[PDB]
Design a protein around this nucleic acid. Structure first.
Ligand SMILES: [Zn+2]
Length: 1270
DNA sequence: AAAAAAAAAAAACCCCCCCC
DNA sequence: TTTTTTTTTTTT
DNA sequence: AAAAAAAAAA
RNA sequence: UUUUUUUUUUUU
């Protein structure tokens, strides 16, 4: 074990290019401690010095840029700071701490150019209290210490003699001189004297000499100073930071890497396959060899990308050593030239990397993506853990104790395994469970095919962290066309044998701190399990196979992880139950929210296997399931260190795509046990018996007569947990009590161990209320409070208005949509007006709405930027229930639990059905009546007939009013169809197919007469045989509810097209011109299509929508006569003047038009073309639209930069904007494989720009040729 | 009689880009 | 000049 | 019928 | 810093 400390004078850290030079340089050496002198920074600039992998940065700076120091500690160093102090002027900084339980003090000092020895002596005198045997004083001393430190072999002056005497007094010696008495290496070059001297020194107490190993001076190209590396021996307390290898996506994207990697895979699979080894061990060897080859390719890539750098570095070292031996001017000139060339090439490399990053950020500058989501989101808490309460009860910091305690805790969590199989079988036998038939069990046991593997791999989410092997989903996706055969062979092997590779058993658990909880307690840490991609592929194949039948295996009461089943089914059902209990004249009911204590990790694997056997699952599928849970294990990745693996004897392996389905199956045994237990009394809502409802492990149990029912439920829960491990926290589980006598409530409190909430309980993020009359108060008022709180949090968020529009869509809209879905009750207009005011105040940053919310409320015709309409989303959510009304699915028990004292089955007969017979129904209804009222509202708004439609069901009242026998109506439904159009009307009555007369043959004559009398009537014929609009198709055609809210919202937006002013027509009025509909369509399309990135579209939206503010507008606002044009003209300051007719902006437009003339484009000098994108009918050619679009948008950016600045906007700024967009779009295109289009649209523009730019401006603005004729 | 659409009146805050 | 809010009228 | 992103619940 | 389900938005 050794510690490396590096010193370096750098002479400024202000250039954004220069700081990245530090990041690459420091990471290249990878030292334990790196210190920086002469940062040329102030106090307020400390926030800018951030380096990846070095989180411990201590910066001391003054009020002016004359000095500055910093001490940095790498993340791989076990450093515990103890004392930190900073000099006022930033000339020096010292940090004292313990590395591997050994004291070490670092004093980084940047001496002044004049009087350095006196300053160093004063610093030593001031720091005498901190000096010790483990204290190092080092940095730029600006003076040699010995004769051998000068190339001229000259003695030191009197000041340096005083400094040496002070060092001797302070018991300090030169470590570098002691280790290398005859060394002549130098770090500084004095230009006026043409001499070399060593002015950077490291000194310390002689006690450290017992640990000193070696030291050297490594010359640097960063500045004129040379770095010094000191290596010291330390006690062997090294942390085993063997970071798990991971396959980054950048390495995969390289074509040469792709070719060599596929060649290596092919060669391995052609040589290392045989009859003597199984496919599992061969697959493990394949993974190991792939990891080795990937490491080798990454290493050679790192070597080749640094080939020229390394060559110039070697030449620099040779010339520097020769100069140190004897100084010559020619060698100095050669060193200067080669250093300049190397600096230029490395600066180009840094520009390439930073431009890649900036283009990635710019393509998603304001879109719905990571840069915005992480912008609004709070800074993610570090996963490193430094303090955990141990088993004894003491607060400890020792990393080995923390690791041992956390590993023992997570091992004991998964080690409680039960072996009582007899009790398991008895419990499974006691209560009936569904069984799959032969067809479904053969569907499960069907062989795996290559197409299934391709579909599974193509569905794998990307950008997800890999498992222990470090192989990501992109590895399988890119190499799929070679990986399907051998993955298929492996899967056939595991089907035949039932043995999985050892990689399928290992998982990586990462600990995440729970927000709002104590991070010093081990029990407030969320365990997240990561799996290898192949294991996830197999598990997801099995999950899909069992998901094809999970509808039969799982009752509809459980909605978690069930496809086509939505969470709010339980919320609405629970609210309806609460309403019924409230309406009951005598209250003897209980509603429990069972809080399971880590149910996912407490389900016994043997119980899972026994349950799967009892459900009729056998063959290859059950064998594979057993093989998965044969020897599972996981290891905790704590502080980046892989801990010892511990077995998963019990619990279901999280992070597995198949795990939720297995947990649902296991919990369904308990669910059916509760439902089939007659001693547990549910709540009877007419013909619907409601006992319990499930969402994953979250369970709600409704009971009647709780005194006996709750005890029976607890007894059955204990019996279930004795065989499955499903432990519940009964003392924490919240519940309601509804009792008509307080003594009974007290007795129930005494007997039961549940805790009863007086007002609300949380359930699926929804605050269920004891009295449903307070649903709005307990669910929507806090919603507005939270929305206002987040708005205030993002009051000064650094984004434009489109960024905040997308923020509203991305963070506020989903929560509001979910709350609407859960509780779509009649909401007063006050709530919506407050929500709209809060959102709008957020959007415009407390300013007035520059662009009317009515314009942005429109579709993409407003510019592809939509402001969310919360009223329309509310209406869509309310009307969504009508779809479930029409479908009348048997699994929708939530819709049949609405209280009603009349018309028990009505909700299936409103959609496309005769109106109620003047019956006042749903008086106490909470969700259905409002949905019906809204449905009628939109139906009347459409001038539509909502009572008879081509989609009217056969089961509808339109045929049941004719006293038709049931058997006839079932026959019609089964043989013909669902809608009346299938039967036929008028001349088409039962005549659209020979099957029509066939079914007529087995129809009762009276019912057939009634059907003929009804269908052939003229009114029915016209009302049926008409083309249905989109609104009818939304609720009748699709049998799937996926994307229902989107379609209803789009249709409602089309319906509620409020009249809006068209500001493009206002623009036309400004320039005394009239635009046709073609011109407006072209302007809108240009606004939507201006550029792929959102900033350019935002600029075009701002200029076309008259977002920018005009001087006459201000004169009117202030009610004053100061309507004169800004920047000084003497003319009126209208918007068209500010954009086009301004005398101070005309030269820029003349330069632009000269550029178009150089493009051989005779575009007329008409402001519509650049300001709005409207082209004359004579210039419909699209071979140049993109180029001129980019030039005009850059001109608009430049003009907007100088909106009121009296200076004329300059052509060089316009070219600078061109090159900013050039870099952004080029790197976006090279990332998106759009090279050909990018060249085709900017090649001539780049040529013209380079021809019109002088060499000095090109060099100073980093403008140069970047693409070729490729 | 209640809900939805339209018209009239009033009040706003002299830039605009930039900013991960 | 443009936007939002309130008020008045009309229709279901 | 694909890709990407977010959010909600567990 | 996973897994599943559901929901929305944008780009064809
Ligand atoms: Zn002007």
């Amino acid at each position: 074990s050794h510690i490396t400390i590096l010193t370096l004078n750098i002479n400024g850290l202000n250039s954004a290019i220069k700081r990245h030079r530090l990041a690459s340089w420091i990471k290249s050496q990878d030292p334990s401690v790196c210190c920086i002198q002469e940062t040329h920074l102030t106090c307020r600039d400390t926030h800018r010095l951030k380096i990846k992998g070095w989180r411990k940065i201590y910066q001391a700076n003054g009020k002016q840029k004359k000095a500055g120091v910093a001490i940095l500690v790498s993340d791989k160093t076990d450093f515990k700071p103890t004392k930190i102090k900073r000099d006022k002027e930033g000339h020096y900084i010292m940090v004292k701490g313990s590395i591997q339980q050994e004291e070490l003090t670092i004093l980084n000092i940047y001496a002044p150019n004049t009087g350095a020895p006196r300053f160093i002596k004063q610093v030593l005198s001031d720091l005498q209290r901190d000096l010790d045997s483990h204290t190092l004083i080092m940095g730029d001393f600006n003076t040699p210490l010995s004769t051998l430190d000068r190339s001229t072999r000259q003695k030191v002056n009197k000041d340096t003699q005083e400094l040496n005497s002070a060092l001797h007094q302070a018991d300090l010696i030169d470590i570098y001189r002691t280790l290398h008495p005859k060394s002549t290496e130098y770090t500084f070059f004095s230009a006026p004297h043409h001499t070399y001297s060593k002015i950077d020194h490291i000194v310390g107490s002689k006690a450290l000499l017992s640990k000193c190993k070696r030291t050297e001076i490594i010359t640097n190209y960063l500045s004129d100073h040379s770095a010094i590396k000191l290596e010291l021996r330390i006690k062997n307390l090294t942390q085993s930071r063997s970071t798990t290898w991971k396959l980054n996506n950048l390495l995969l994207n390289d074509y040469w890497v792709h070719n060599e990697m596929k060649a290596e895979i092919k060669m391995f699979f052609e040589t290392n396959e045989n009859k003597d080894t199984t496919y599992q061990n061969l697959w493990d060897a394949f993974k190991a060899v792939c990891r080795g080859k990937f490491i080798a390719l990454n290493a050679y890539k790192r070597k080749q990308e640094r080939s020229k750098i390394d060559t110039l570095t070697s030449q620099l070292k040779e010339l520097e050593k020769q100069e140190q031996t004897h100084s010559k001017a020619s060698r100095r000139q050669e060193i200067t030239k080669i250093r300049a060339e190397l600096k230029e090439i490395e600066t180009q490399k840094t520009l390439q990397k930073i431009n890649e990053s900036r283009s990635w950020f710019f393509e998603r500058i304001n879109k719905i993506d990571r840069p915005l989501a992480r912008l609004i989101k709070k800074k993610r808490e570090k996963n490193q853990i430094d303090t955990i309460k141990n088993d004894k009860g003491d607060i400890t910091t020792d990393p080995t104790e923390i690791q041992t305690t956390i590993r023992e805790y997570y091992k004991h969590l998964y080690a409680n395994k039960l072996e009582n199989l007899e009790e398991m079988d008895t419990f499974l036998d006691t209560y009936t469970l569904p069984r799959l038939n032969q067809e479904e069990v053969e569907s499960l046991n069907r062989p795996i095919t290559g197409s299934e593997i391709v579909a599974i791999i193509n569905s794998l989410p990307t950008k997800k962290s890999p498992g222990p092997d470090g192989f990501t989903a992109e590895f399988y996706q890119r190499y799929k066309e070679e990986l399907v055969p051998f993955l298929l062979k492996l899967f056939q092997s595991i089907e035949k044998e039932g043995i999985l590779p050892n990689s399928f058993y290992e998982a990586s658990i990462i600990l995440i701190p729970k927000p709002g909880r104590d991070t010093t307690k081990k029990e407030n840490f969320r365990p997240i399990s990561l799996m290898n991609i192949d294991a996830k592929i197999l598990n997801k194949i099995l999950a899909n196979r069992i998901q094809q039948h999970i509808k039969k295996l799982i009752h509809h009461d459980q909605v978690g992880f069930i496809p086509g089943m939505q969470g709010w089914f339980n919320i609405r059902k629970s609210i309806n139950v609460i309403q019924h209990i409230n309406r009951a004249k005598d209250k003897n009911h209980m509603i429990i929210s069972i809080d399971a204590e880590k149910a996912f990790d407490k389900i016994q694997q043997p119980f899972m296997l026994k349950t799967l056997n009892k459900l009729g699952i056998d063959g290859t599928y059950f064998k594979i399931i057993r093989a998965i849970y044969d020897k599972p294990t996981a290891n905790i990745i704590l502080n980046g260190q892989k801990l010892e693996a511990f077995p998963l004897k019990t619990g279901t392996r999280q992070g597995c795509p198949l795990s939720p389905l297995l947990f649902n199956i296991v919990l369904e045994v308990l669910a059916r046990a509760i439902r089939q237990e007659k001693e547990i009394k549910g709540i009877q809502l007419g013909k619907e018996e409601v006992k319990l409802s499930l969402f994953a492990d979250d369970m709600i149990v409704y009971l009647e007569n709780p005194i006996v029912s709750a005890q029976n439920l607890l007894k059955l829960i204990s019996n279930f947990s004795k065989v499955s491990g499903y432990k519940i926290n009964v003392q924490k589980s919240q519940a309601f009590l509804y009792t008509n006598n307080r003594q009974t409530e007290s007795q129930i409190m005494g007997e039961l161990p549940f805790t009863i909430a007086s007002k609300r309980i949380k359930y699926l993020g929804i605050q269920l209320t004891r009295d449903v009359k307070d649903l709005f108060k307990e669910n929507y008022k806090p919603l507005l409070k939270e929305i206002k709180e987040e708005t205030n949090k993002w009051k000064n968020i650094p984004c434009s208005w489109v960024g905040r529009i997308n923020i509203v869509k991305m963070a506020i809209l989903p929560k509001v949509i979910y709350r609407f879905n859960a509780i779509p009750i009649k909401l007063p207009m006050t709530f919506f007006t407050e929500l709209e005011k809060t959102t709008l105040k957020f959007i415009w940053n407390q300013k007035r709405a520059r662009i009317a919310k009515s314009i942005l409320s429109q579709k993409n015709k407003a510019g592809g930027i939509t402001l969310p309409d919360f009223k329309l989303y509310y209406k869509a959510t309310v009307t969504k229930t009508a779809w479930y009304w029409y479908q009348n699915r048997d699994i929708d028990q939530w819709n049949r639990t609405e209280p009603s004292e009349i018309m028990p089955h009505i909700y299936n007969y409103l959609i496309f059905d005769k109106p109620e017979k003047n019956k006042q129904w749903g008086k106490d209804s909470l969700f259905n009546k409002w949905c019906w009222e809204n449905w009628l509202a939109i139906c009347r708004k459409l001038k539509l007939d909502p009572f008879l439609t081509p989609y009217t069901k056969i089961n509808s009242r339109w045929i049941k009013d004719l006293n038709v026998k049931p058997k006839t109506i079932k026959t019609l439904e089964e043989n013909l169809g669902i809608t009346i159009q299938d039967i036929g009307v008028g001349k088409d009555f039962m005549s659209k197919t020979p099957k029509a007369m066939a079914t007529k043959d087995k129809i009762d004559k009276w019912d057939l007469i009634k059907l003929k009398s009804f269908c052939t009537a003229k009114e029915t014929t016209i009302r049926v045989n008409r083309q249905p609009t989109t609104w009818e198709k939304i609720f009748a055609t699709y049998s799937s509810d996926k994307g229902l809210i989107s379609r209803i919202y789009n249709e409602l937006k089309q319906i509620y097209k409020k009249k809006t002013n068209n500001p493009i027509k206002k623009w036309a009025k400004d320039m005394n011109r009239h635009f046709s509909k073609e011109d407006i369509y072209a302007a809108k399309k240009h606004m939507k299509k201006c550029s792929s990135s959102l900033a350019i579209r935002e600029m075009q939206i701002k200029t076309t929508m008259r977002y920018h503010l005009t001087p006459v507008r201000m004169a009117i606002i202030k009610k004053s006569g100061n309507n004169r044009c800004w920047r000084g003209c003497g003319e009126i300051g209208t918007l068209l003047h500010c954009w086009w007719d301004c005398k101070l902006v005309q030269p820029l437009w003349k330069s632009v038009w000269r550029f178009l003339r150089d493009l051989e484009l005779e575009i007329p000098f008409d402001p519509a073309i650049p300001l709005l994108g409207i082209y004359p009918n004579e210039y419909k050619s699209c071979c140049y639209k993109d180029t001129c679009t980019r030039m005009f948008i850059a001109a608009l950016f430049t003009i907007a930069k100088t909106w009121n600045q009296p200076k004329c906007p300059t052509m060089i700024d316009w070219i600078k904007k061109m090159w900013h967009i050039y870099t952004m779009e080029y790197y976006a295109a090279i990332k998106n494989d759009e090279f050909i289009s990018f060249v085709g649209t900017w090649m001539k523009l780049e040529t013209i720009i380079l021809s019109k730019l002088s060499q000095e401006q090109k060099t100073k603005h980093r403008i140069f040729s970047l693409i070729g004729g490729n």
